[PDB]
């Protein structure tokens, strides 16, 4: 299941879909673990959000080229952090377009994070527009709402029971709810219940901080934003 590719680890969750583990060394604290997916659309590659740096980021598509050796036709990230979108030159540099949130491209100089080439705008319903998310096939994105950041985005793997919660949707083992200082006190669990609502076939739920969970994990994850 794990595999140890340079410093990341590489899970496949489907027969073309795989989950990236990027690690971060905090003096003091450890080693930070940052889920992500991999997505192959017959011979072109899609990835979700990047590694910690650039370095990660790179390691990442070297192993593309190298289990799947098809080239990476766009990237999406969730939300204007590091833990996510720690490696947007890697991207660049490598002739990748980069689609993220409208208010991430935003928030990206604020935070110090690169911003993305394309922006995505989202309807009242929270669903991307599809002008603005072209050529994405089985990606499908979805704007839940205030929760972890108000940028952050939900991505669907169409076609399969698969549904990336970002940083936003935690384990259904999870005793906190992660990073709070940027999050919604208020729409943190409407915004939960958003994406099991989005996603209602998905049965894995990736998120970036934990093991693909079921879906008691998008219950427990508002259980507790309920308890703010
Ligand atoms: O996603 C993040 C995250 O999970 C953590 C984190 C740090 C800890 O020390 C923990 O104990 C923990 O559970 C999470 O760092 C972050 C710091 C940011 O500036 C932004 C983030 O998005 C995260
Ligand atoms: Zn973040």
């Known amino acids: 299941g794990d595999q140890r590719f340079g410093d990341l680890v590489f899970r496949q969750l489907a027969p073309n879909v795989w989950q990236h583990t990027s690690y971060l060394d905090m003096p003091g604290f450890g080693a930070v673990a940052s889920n992500g997916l991999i997505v192959r659309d017959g011979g072109r590659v899609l990835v979700v959000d990047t590694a910690w740096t650039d370095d990660q980021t ?16 766009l990237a999406v990230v969730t939300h204007a952090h590091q833990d996510k979108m720690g490696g947007m030159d890697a991207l660049h540099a490598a002739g990748i377009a980069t ?3 409208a208010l991430s ?3 990206a100089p604020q935070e110090g994070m690169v911003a993305a080439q394309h922006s995505l ?8 527009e599809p002008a603005t998310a072209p050529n994405f096939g ?13 940028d952050n985005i939900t991505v669907g793997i169409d076609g399969t029971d698969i549904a990336f ?15 709070l200082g940027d999050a919604d006190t208020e ?14 076939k998905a049965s894995m739920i990736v998120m ?10 998008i219950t427990h994850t508002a259980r507790m934003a309920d308890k703010l």
């Open 165 to 179: 919660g970002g940083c936003l949707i935690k384990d259904s083992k999870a005793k906190s709810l992660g990073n």
């Open 138 to 150: 089985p990606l499908k994105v979805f704007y839940p709402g205030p929760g972890h950041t108000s």
């Open 105 to 107: 491209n935003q928030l």
């Open 187 to 200: 729409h943190y669990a409407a915004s939960a219940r958003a994406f099991g609502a989005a996603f209602p």
């Open 99 to 101: 689609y993220a949130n």
């Open 58 to 73: 790179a390691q990442i598509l070297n192993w593309i080229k190298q289990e799947i050796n098809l080239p990476v036709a």
């Open 208 to 217: 970036s901080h934990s093991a693909p969970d079921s879906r008691a994990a």
């Open 121 to 128: 705008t989202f309807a009242a319903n929270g669903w991307v």
